[PDB]
Amino acid sequence: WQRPTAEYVRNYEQWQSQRNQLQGAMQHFSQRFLYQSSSASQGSPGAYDRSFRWKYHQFRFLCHSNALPSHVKISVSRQTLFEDSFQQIMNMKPYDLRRRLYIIMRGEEGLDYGGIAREWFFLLSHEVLNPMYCLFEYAGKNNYCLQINPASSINPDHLTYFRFIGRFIAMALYHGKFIDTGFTLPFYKRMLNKRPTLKDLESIDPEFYNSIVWIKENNLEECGLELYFIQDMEILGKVTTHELKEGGESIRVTEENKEEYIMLLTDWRFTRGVEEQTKAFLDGFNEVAPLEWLRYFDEKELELMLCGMQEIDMSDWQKSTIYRHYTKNSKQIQWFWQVVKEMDNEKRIRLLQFVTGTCRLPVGGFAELIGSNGPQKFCIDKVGKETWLPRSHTCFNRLDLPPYKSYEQLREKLLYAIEETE
Ligand code: NA
């Protein structure tokens, strides 16, 4: 479907190298885990404690409880995996996708149908990113910041493909299997009916972020203004202007209209060009696994449910950290790593998601970390004043850590910053 352009061919290759990296990465992928099934009354979650564990068990309980009996057989060939999965899953009634899932890899026997189901989920979760289908693009170099392609309607079946992707992701959650497609935290936020934020723009589009901030920083008029409640987009040529409001072309932007402007424009940047595609994703998801079942999860917990946890090697982490104005030996940095040393693995993941915008770690670990601009190690900067919380720049894998005056000040601030939502 994709027109044979300069970007398309660049993207084609980059995705092919993913395929050459695919085999090795699945051994790494096999070490992802969550929690052993609840051993209670029909896997009852127990009494509510705010933990991720409880939410996991609670959500599994609903899956178990609502699952149709018997089983369903998805029959696919290793080399036509996308097309075969798509045909099978989209000709089933969505309720039948909640029955126990048997993946039959054509001509491959061997048992450990769990093994096989896990591999299929992993491989299918990369296969959907094939540039050929026009569904996705990245915002940075490499595979940085996956987003729906606004020119996806190049593929005339693109909405039905988004529906299948929705079903497949729900089936991952529904059967406790991990995927690796690489959706962003704001994309999870949309699955939770949560409104993405100005801070979130920094993750997906730092340039666009830096300006929206320099609108709200700057007083207006002083240094010009000259804006309407409109924004342009360029979907496959057609420089389509888009009203921020109804009759927006006339609706002219003042200083009085500026916080409204920012809210509408924040909202615009996340939704622009990808509305029908996201709707089709959500409808596919929702017919297999009700989105209402996600109600306890924040976007980071949702990510972790889908991707699975991995153990964080402290040594690798600490080894591949770089500093700005701090050294390794600085007082605040000593306290930082002490707090990290005392965290359990799940809070270590929480901090990783806070600083980098994902729970996922590249195959080499911390030395291989990508920011927007390409390689970018985990970085701690001496920035802020004491009464500030720590802040991150996910674009740069960067934590701004105020020069706090004690371990307990730092500890409480950092724990607070990482546990916050919206
Ligand atoms: Na096969």
Numbering used by the authors: 358 to 395, 482 to 865
Q: What does the published report state?
A:
The HECT E3 ubiquitin ligases 1 (WWP1) and 2 (WWP2) are responsible for the ubiquitin-mediated degradation of key tumour suppressor proteins and are dysregulated in various cancers and diseases. The HECT-E3 ligases may offer the best druggability as they participate directly in the Ub transfer, unlike the RING-type, and with their catalytic function relying on a single active-site cysteine.
However, we were able to solve and refine structures for the apo-proteins which were improvements on previously published data. The WWP2-LH crystal structure was solved at a resolution of 2.05 Å in the same space group as that reported in the literature. Unfortunately, however, the WW2 domain was still disordered and therefore missing from the structure. The ligand poses of compound 11 in both WWP1-2L34H and WWP2-LH are somewhat similar due to the similarities of the proposed binding site between these two enzymes. Against WWP2-LH, the butyrate chain has multiple hydrophobic contacts with the aromatic ring of Tyr587 and the alkyl side chain of Ile813, with the backbone amide from Ile813 also undergoing hydrogen bonding with the carbonyl oxygen of the ester. Lastly, the side chain of Ser646, located at the rear of the cavity, forms a halogen bond with one of the heterocyclic chlorides. Interestingly, all compounds modelled against WWP2-LH also participate in halogen bonding between Ser646 and the same heterocyclic chloride.
